[PDB]
Paper text:
[name]-[name]-2 uses the receptor-binding domain (RBD) in the S protein to interact with [name] 2 ([name]), which is also the receptor of [name]-[name]. The cellular [name] receptor is one of the key determinants of the host range. We found that [name] from sperm whales, minke whales, dolphins, sea lions, fur seals and hippopotami could efficiently bind to the RBD of both [name]-[name] and [name]-[name]-2 and facilitate the transduction of [name]-[name] and [name]-[name]-2 pseudoviruses into [name]-expressing cells. Then, we chose minke whale [name] and sea lion [name], which displayed high binding affinities to both RBDs, for further study and determined their cryo-electron microscopy (cryo-EM) structures in complex with either [name]-[name]-2 RBD or [name]-[name] RBD.
We prepared complexes of MW-[name]/[name]-[name]-2 RBD, MW-[name]/[name]-[name] RBD, SL-[name]/[name]-[name]-2 RBD and SL-[name]/[name]-[name] RBD, and solved their structures at resolutions of 2.87, 2.93, 3.03 and 2.89 Å, respectively. However, the MW-[name]/[name]-[name] RBD and SL-[name]/[name]-[name] RBD complexes showed more divergent architecture with hACE2 complexed with [name]-[name] RBD, with RMSD of 1.598 Å and 2.069 Å, respectively. Notably, MW-[name] showed even higher binding affinity with [name]-[name] RBD than hACE2. Notably, MW-[name] forms significantly more van der Waals (vdw) contacts and comparable H-bonds with [name]-[name] RBD than hACE2, which explains its stronger binding to the [name]-[name] RBD. When bound to the [name]-[name] RBD, R42 (corresponding to Q42 in hACE2), E325 (corresponding to G326 in hACE2) and N329 (corresponding to N330 in hACE2) on MW-[name] form additional H-bonds. When bound to the [name]-[name] RBD, MW-[name] shows five substitutions, including D30Q, Q42R, L79I, M82T and E329V (328 in MW-[name] numbering). V328 (329 in hACE2 numbering) and R392 (393 in hACE2 numbering) are no longer involved in RBD recognition. On the [name]-[name] RBD, S432, T433, D463, D480, T485 and Q492 interact with MW-[name] but not with hACE2, and Y481 exclusively interacts with hACE2. When binding to the [name]-[name] RBD, MW-[name] involves another substitution, E329V, which negates a salt bridge between E329 and R426. Notably, R42 of MW-[name] forms two H-bonds with Y436 and Y484 of the [name]-[name] RBD, and E325 of MW-[name] forms an H-bond with Q492.
Residue numbers in the entry:
A (entry chain B): 321 to 506
B (entry chain A): 19 to 711
Write the structure that this text describes.
Amino acid sequence: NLCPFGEVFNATKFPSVYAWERKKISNCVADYSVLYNSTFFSTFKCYGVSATKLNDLCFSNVYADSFVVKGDDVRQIAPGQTGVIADYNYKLPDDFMGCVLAWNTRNIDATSTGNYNYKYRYLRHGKLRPFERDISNVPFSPDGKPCTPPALNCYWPLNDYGFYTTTGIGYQPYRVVVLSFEGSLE
Amino acid sequence: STTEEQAKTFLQKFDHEAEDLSYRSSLASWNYNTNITDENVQKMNAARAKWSAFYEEQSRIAKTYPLEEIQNLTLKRQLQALQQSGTSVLSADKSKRLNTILNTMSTIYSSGKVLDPNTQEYLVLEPGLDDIMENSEDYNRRLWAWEGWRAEVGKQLRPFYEEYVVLENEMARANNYEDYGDYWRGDYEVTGADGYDYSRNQLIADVERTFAEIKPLYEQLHAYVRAKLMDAYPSRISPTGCLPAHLLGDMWGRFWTNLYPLTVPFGEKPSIDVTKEMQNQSWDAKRIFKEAEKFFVSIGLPNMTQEFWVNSMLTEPGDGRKVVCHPTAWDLGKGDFRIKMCTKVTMDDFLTAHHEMGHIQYDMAYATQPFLLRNGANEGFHEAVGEIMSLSAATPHYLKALGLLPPDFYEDNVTEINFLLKQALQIVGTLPFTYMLEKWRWMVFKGEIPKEQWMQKWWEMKREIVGVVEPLPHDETYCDPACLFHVAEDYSFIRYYTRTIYQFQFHEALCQTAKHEGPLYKCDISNSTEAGQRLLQMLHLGKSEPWTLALENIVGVKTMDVKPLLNYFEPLLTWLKEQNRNSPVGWSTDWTPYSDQSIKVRISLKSALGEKAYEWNDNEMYLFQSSVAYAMREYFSKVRNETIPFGEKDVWVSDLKPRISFNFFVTTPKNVSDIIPRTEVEEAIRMSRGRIN
Ligand SMILES: [Zn+2]
């Protein structure tokens, strides 16, 4: 069958960056023609492979990691990057093999009054491992002793993205689909 | 974790929550300004209240982390900016009485009006009294509006301002300052740096030092304007005295720019105005900003974002929406930069487009700084960046490059001198006014001026620092400084002095990097990317570095310097000296507009010296003022055969030395401009016993 890329990029539900969801793509003929030819995506940064050589290669498993980040946070979805999104929300290994696809969705995910349905983790004890997910909304203390907010030095680790249609492109919502390819060295 | 690590994560929580509340407050403010109604005021104030309440509640939490524990300088700057409390230290009783005083002072100023001699007419400050002060050239009508504003707004604001000083001094001393003026000088306070330290006492030293160098330029400009005002008002202004306060082109004498038609050097030559050449090239409001944008992209600054053009209100809306028609540049946050300007195709709005975009460029530069460090280096830096853009935009070189002037255009020395004189009336004429007014408040907060000498010292420094005489004697019932908007609005006024000095320090430094050969007033930094790169060094810093270091980046020195300002008006100083060869240069504080007809009174102390029974200090002086009116009132009815209700208001007292002497004169009611000659007054005095010979 055809790999349902239209069920990933055109999905009406994109999860938060800290709660990013992964879909397994396999046992389907891989047709990536809609990606590179179309100018829909604002980023097509492939790593460890070439976009033109995707068609030539085959026999791999594809994982599609979908989430929404800020406009300025797409820089941190590159392998070897540092930030509140790379360290605490979504980390890519330095040997990552795949392509990162992001496109502006100010029309969809941004509202005049502010769309706060998307959250990111900015407080954590230690950085995330590559392809590791932390969805625990427990209060954070710099020393590490548990406490109940509101208090001093006790904060919630998740803070909402404030998405408006009037903000600059760096503060506008972007939907990011990270594609992971099973390498020939399986 | 140490206290710096705990303050580091507190700033992360603040920066995220401050960003949304600040953006919501600014977003609500924009909708009100772009659509004035009753619903938008509620949303504007509600959003502003949330941001204010959050900032105040978060400010005390920041003080939980002492600054000395924080080793990192970036975090130390942010907490220091957040740990400032202000009126928080005051008790609930005192912090609520202060808001009552501050709001009542703004209400009195906003609702101030005078009733014309035409009885069925009230004249508000805008546009009623401002039109008389800016446009009218009648001595009698200007003194009516000038004295009327002082007698109405100033007298009501006097009791509130005395309590304002006491309450604000208590707040400042609670925050460990010496006085409320010392609190205001903390905007130029750098303490954590090494070699970049600026004290609060250093500000007054530099302000006073720089003003001593502007005085030779201002005296030559004061002498030229004085001679020209003698042509317009013959016999009403002394050739060697000061300038009457009501003849300075506006209500307060802050700017002399409205005296240009009277003091134009070469009136035959017209000004270099391109407003009618823009109308003939089909220029629009968007065209003006598009050309302003290319100026900043010429010097290497970034162009305006695509969000700027859609979001900004660059013209008055066609539909019937009330908008504020005051040009401003908006940094709402979240990368949202807007300009609200009711743009007209005129040239004056063309220069405003370069000024307002000079703010957006500053805001865009430090937009990557931490949220608490996203502002100008100090209060004078932001308004200096915009002004230097208008200096290059008004240059005939810039106008010819835009096609608004013919390529074969002669810049004659007559037109250039007219330009510098126009600049001096606005830039130089305000410096002594700004210095003197803020010096008065600094000494009033310091307690150096007792509240019984507030008006004695206000007009003593006006006649000595500004060279301006009061047309009428104001005696301790007026608050003349409070009649200005800023004084009654609890706004520091020294920012308008330092901004002028910084303006020509930036302009001279940028023109040097642009390799400009010639006078400084003909400099255009356009198409010089190196000038923009030097400018961006200061712009991107924001509040991250002390303003002394930020000043050093663009200027090369970390001290305020006025020699660049004196270099701008060097061609005008040469021309002013040639004109003032046969005119007096300088003013004498002795002469007053009422001194010639003033009658001195000698008090003979017939009572025993040093007796507690008779305290003849201040309670008995009002009887003579209300008694002399009766003598003149009876005199006019008997002799002049006309009845005039003379009262204590009509008799004016000046140079009052208690128990010794005082000078007085009488004026016709509602006609204070024309004062009765002393001979007629002495004729009434000669009718009774002759006390003074
Ligand atoms: Zn401005």
